[PDB]
Amino acid sequence: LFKPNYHFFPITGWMNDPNGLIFWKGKYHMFYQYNPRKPEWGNICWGHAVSDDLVHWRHLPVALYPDDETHGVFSGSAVEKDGKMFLVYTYYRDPTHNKGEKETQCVVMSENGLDFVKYDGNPVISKPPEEGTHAFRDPKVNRSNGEWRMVLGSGKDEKIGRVLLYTSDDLFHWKYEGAIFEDETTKEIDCPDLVRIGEKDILIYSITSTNSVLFSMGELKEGKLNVEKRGLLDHGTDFYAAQTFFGTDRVVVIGWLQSWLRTGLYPTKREGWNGVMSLPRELYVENNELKVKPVDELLALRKRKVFETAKSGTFLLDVKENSYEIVCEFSGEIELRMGNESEEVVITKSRDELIVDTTRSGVSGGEVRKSTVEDEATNRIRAFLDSCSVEFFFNDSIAFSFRIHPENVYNILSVKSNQVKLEVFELENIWL
Numbered sequence: 001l002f003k004p005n006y007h008f009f010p011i012t013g014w015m016n017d018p019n020g021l022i023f024w025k026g027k028y029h030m031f032y033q034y035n036p037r038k039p040e041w042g043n044i045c046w047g048h049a050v051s052d053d054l055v056h057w058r059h060l061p062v063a064l065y066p067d068d069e070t071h072g073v074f075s076g077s078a079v080e081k082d083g084k085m086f087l088v089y090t091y092y093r094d095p096t097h098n099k100g101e102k103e104t105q106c107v108v109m110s111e112n113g114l115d116f117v118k119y120d121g122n123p124v125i126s127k128p129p130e131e132g133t134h135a136f137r138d139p140k141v142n143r144s145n146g147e148w149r150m151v152l153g154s155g156k157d158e159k160i161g162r163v164l165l166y167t168s169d170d171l172f173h174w175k176y177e178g179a180i181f182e183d184e185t186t187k188e189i190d191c192p193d194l195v196r197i198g199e200k201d202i203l204i205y206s207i208t209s210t211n212s213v214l215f216s217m218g219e220l221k222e223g224k225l226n227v228e229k230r231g232l233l234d235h236g237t238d239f240y241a242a243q244t245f246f247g248t249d250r251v252v253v254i255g256w257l258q259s260w261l262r263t264g265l266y267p268t269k270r271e272g273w274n275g276v277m278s279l280p281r282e283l284y285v286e287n288n289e290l291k292v293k294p295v296d297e298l299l300a301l302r303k304r305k306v307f308e309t310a311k312s313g314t315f316l317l318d319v320k321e322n323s324y325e326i327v328c329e330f331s332g333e334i335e336l337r338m339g340n341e342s343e344e345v346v347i348t349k350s351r352d353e354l355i356v357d358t359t360r361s362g363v364s365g366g367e368v369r370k371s372t373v374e375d376e377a378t379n380r381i382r383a384f385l386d387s388c389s390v391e392f393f394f395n396d397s398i399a400f401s402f403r404i405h406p407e408n409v410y411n412i413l414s415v416k417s418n419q420v421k422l423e424v425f426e427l428e429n430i431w432l
């Protein structure tokens with residue numbers, strides 16, 4: 001029932017954060033937090049997959065293992081140096097009765113993308129820079145002004161979450177440059193990512209207590225991110241631990257398509273697996289605003305046009321599974337429902353608000369989420385339905401991602417608006 005047709009998910013066991021995202025030697029590499037042993041978190045390794053086109057994933061052998069039963073290979077990033085692939089990651093030691101957990105930052109190298117060797121000088125960063133630092137992890141490394149820069153997530157005095165910055169000329173010797181950013185609404189920050197998009201420094205980061213990916217855009221000046229604008233990267237319930245790819249022109253982000261808060265509510269563990277990755281999105285700046293849209297490569301998934309209409313109504317779709325894309329252009333207000341006789345997801349544009357309701361979606365129920373949006377002459381929704389998810393994209397500007405678990409095919413579509421142009425495309429199964 002719930003195995004995705006065109007999203008990445010593990011062949012068995014548990015998966016969370018996307019790691020080591022890199023375009024290397026002509027192919028997109030994606031690693032991930034992985035426990036093959038069972039559909040729950042534990043004994044974490046880095047799984048590995050590859051695609052030519054950000055869509056057609058193929059599983060590779062597990063890339064990184066912990067050395068023993070009391071450690072984990074926590075999240076991190078990937079870069080290219082001297083033609084070789086380097087992975088930079090947090091190595092985690094379990095707490096014991098006398099000791100708290102210990103986190104260090106380490107480096108691994110690969111000349112072929114298949115075999116990975118450990119740097120002899122590990123750990124590359126052996127301890128936190130200040131006292132009272134906890135959750136010291138998730139190194140995201142990029143190039144800036146002739147130098148390597150690393151951002152790390154952290155928490156200070158069990159009170160305020162901060163992003164720490166280190167620099168390096170060679171990827172092995174790092175210098176602490178202070179806390180560039182803090183968010184007082186959380187005790188810790190996960191999975192930071194500092195990118196540059198058109199004259200602007202953008203800090204992407206995750207907060208575990210609301211399970212949200214936020215951003216702060218502005219200018220790094222004198223060791224501090226001067227924030228001009230703030231927001232969410234995604235407005236739904238299931239988008240977490242976002243990371244962007246190294247080595248591409250566009251900024252391309254993938255997130256974990258799941259929530260820590262709602263993990264115990266989901267049914268895939270019965271099938272022997274847990275965890276799904278989001279579709280990739282391009283992040284870009286237009287009119288001094290950060291915008292999110294689906295990557296262009298997703299168009300290749302479109303097989304045959306199952307349905308189309310230029311008027312409102314309720315329609316039976318000729319689809320045999322939950323694997324399709326709704327493309328909908330409209331003016332004014334809209335109500336779009338997708339579902340069957342027992343289940344539905346509803347998205348409504350009511351005045352200056354976009355609202356999504358997955359409470360009736362399937363066997364994990366759901367929630368209601370909303371965002372205020374700018375009016376346009378013509379609006380556009382793209383909705384990607386797969387076996388256990390729906391991702392909505394609006395005006396190439398914002399995204400809402402939700403995990404849903406329908407017991408049956410969503411073969412009924414209802415639209416109510418003026419000036420509607422709606423199409424449905426079957427989406428290809430990438431596996432078989």
Ligand SMILES: OC[C@H]1O[C@H](OC[C@H]2O[C@H](O[C@]3(CO)O[C@H](CO)[C@@H](O)[C@@H]3O)[C@H](O)[C@@H](O)[C@@H]2O)[C@H](O)[C@@H](O)[C@H]1O
Nearest residue numbers: 016017033041044074075090137138190191208241260
């Ligand atoms: O306090 C120990 C903690 O261990 C487990 O969770 C670890 C960690 O997982 C999450 O952080 C990320 C982001 O999703 O996931 C990887 C680990 O796989 C981290 O590198 C990265 O920061 C959560 O978001 C954190 O709050 C959490 O500490 C276990 O699952 C917890 O119950 C707890 O025992």
